[PDB]
Design a protein around this ligand. Structure first.
Ligand SMILES: Nc1ncnc2c1c(-c1ccc(NC(=O)c3ccccc3)cc1)cn2C1CCCC1
Ligand SMILES: [Ca+2]
Ligand SMILES: [Cl-]
Length: 429
């Protein structure tokens, strides 16, 4: 017997899936990955449920202040989101001290403004002065005035329902299931439409126009990208095998990063949040790097922004199934695309972000640039760019692609850009 409990509200949208309120319990009957067959205890109905909407009874995940599988940087982003205030906190798996837990607390500071400070927890305790049998008790105490903390505990971090998992056994779907409602953009290779999958589900469809490339071999290449899932890559949901091929991805509410930075709201975005974007793209490129693959076309036009202002990477694994200002020299000439050729493109993308979407090398045509890259000309630093940030672009713009950084390093440098190493966690006597 395995009892689980709902963490959020879910209304059914399919045939054999269940509806449940927050707090409903149910018996796990089958573990089919993203979807589980369960029998509700409230309605006694047997059906399918999203496994990422429930957890085992009286687990820590059930608790409103606990956050599973979240990094220190995500915990920082989640707390500095709108809807939280002074004292807003969370308890999470310690990213560094594995098998243990850390506490992230929102705090204000005149020097910078809102910040997130992190304390490690070691029965548990932070300072030997105060011992605690369990976390909830430990929480309660620190809600009663800051016992050494930078602030007194107020409310757990605001969380929203995760994205509903895709329909089961629906990697290949008929076109009839779709209603392409609005053309978002078109190009030399096809159109990107925003659509709807059998009502209830809002998707975006990339219509791949008929060609030589992968007529019967697209599904093959495309089936690999499906296994390269990441929180910072655009999620591939479904595919239409009948030519013209349709690619169903998740809908990114605020379009491309390029169009977004050129937007009004985008122009309002300050500098530390632009670097936050960069650190997200770098996080995604660090994954493609770990899988020893390649994106082949990094630019703001290929970065999408969610409604929550989360940057994700598209298309990826598309240039291998079919423009040079973002391209490194050793690919313009020798046609050699490495993971380091993307590093160059990231440096360009970085500048593209700091300049709010300004075209690289402005008032400077393509041929008038290639002959400068041989001289050693690089784009200059603008007034609004940190010296230590232009420093990174230049490292991405090294002539030797071997002495260019890794995305693993680039991400780490961008994640704690305003944080000194020693200041990551707080000391307490
Ligand atoms: N998903 C979206 N949601 C909201 N807006 C989107 C998009 C997309 C968009 C971008 C890229 C893709 N395609 C892919 O990511 C992809 C395609 C084939 C193989 C592997 C990956 C599909 C849609 C593009 N836009 C905008 C940007 C420019 C035109 C409309
Ligand atoms: Ca310290
Ligand atoms: Cl039962």
């Amino acid at each position: 017997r395995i009892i689980v409990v709902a963490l959020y509200d879910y209304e059914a949208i399919h045939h054999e899936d269940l509806s449940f309120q927050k707090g409903d319990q149910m018996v796990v009957l089958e573990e089919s990955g993203e979807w589980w067959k369960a029998r509700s205890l409230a309605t006694r109905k047997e059906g399918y449920i999203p496994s990422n909407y429930v957890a085992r009874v009286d687990s820590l995940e059930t608790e409103e202040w606990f956050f599973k599988g979240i990094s220190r940087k995500d915990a920082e982003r989640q707390l500095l989101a709108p809807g939280n205030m002074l004292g807003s906190f969370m308890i999470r798996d310690s990213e560094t001290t594995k098998g243990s837990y850390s506490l992230s607390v929102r705090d204000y500071d005149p020097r910078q403004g809102d910040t997130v400070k992190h304390y490690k927890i070691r029965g548990f305790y932070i300072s030997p002065r105060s011992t605690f049998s369990t976390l909830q008790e430990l929480v309660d105490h620190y809600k009663k005035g800051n016992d050494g903390l930078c602030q007194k505990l107020s409310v757990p971090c605001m969380s929203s329902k995760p994205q509903k998992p895709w329909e089961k056994d629906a990697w290949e779907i008929p076109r009839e299931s779709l209603k392409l409602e609005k053309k978002l953009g078109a190009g030399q290779f096809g159109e990107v439409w925003m659509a709807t999958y059998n009502k209830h589900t809002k998707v975006a469809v990339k219509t791949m126009k008929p060609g030589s490339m992968s007529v019967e071999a697209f599904l093959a290449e495309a089936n690999v990208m499906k296994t390269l899932q990441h929180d910072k890559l655009v999620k591939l949901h479904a595919v239409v095998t009948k030519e013209p091929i349709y690619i169903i991805t998740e809908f990114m509410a605020k379009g491309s990063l390029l169009d977004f930075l050129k937007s009004d709201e985008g122009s309002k975005q300050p500098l530390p949040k632009l670097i936050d974007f960069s650190a997200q793209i770098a996080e995604g490129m660090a994954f493609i790097e770990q899988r020893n693959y390649i994106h082949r076309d990094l630019r703001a036009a290929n970065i999408l922004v969610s409604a929550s202002l989360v940057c994700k990477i598209a298309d990826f694994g598309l240039a291998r199934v079919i423009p040079i200002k973002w391209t490194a020299p050793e690919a313009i000439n020798f046609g050699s695309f490495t993971i380091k050729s993307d590093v160059w493109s990231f440096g360009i993308l970085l500048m593209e972000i700091v300049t709010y979407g300004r075209i690289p090398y402005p008032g400077m045509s393509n041929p008038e640039v290639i002959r400068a890259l041989e001289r050693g000309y690089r784009m200059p630093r603008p007034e609004n760019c940190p010296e230590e940030l232009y420093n990174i672009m230049m490292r991405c713009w090294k002539n030797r692609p071997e002495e260019r950084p890794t995305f693993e390093y680039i991400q780490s440098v961008l994640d704690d850009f305003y944080t000194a190493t020693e200041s990551q966690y707080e000391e307490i006597p």
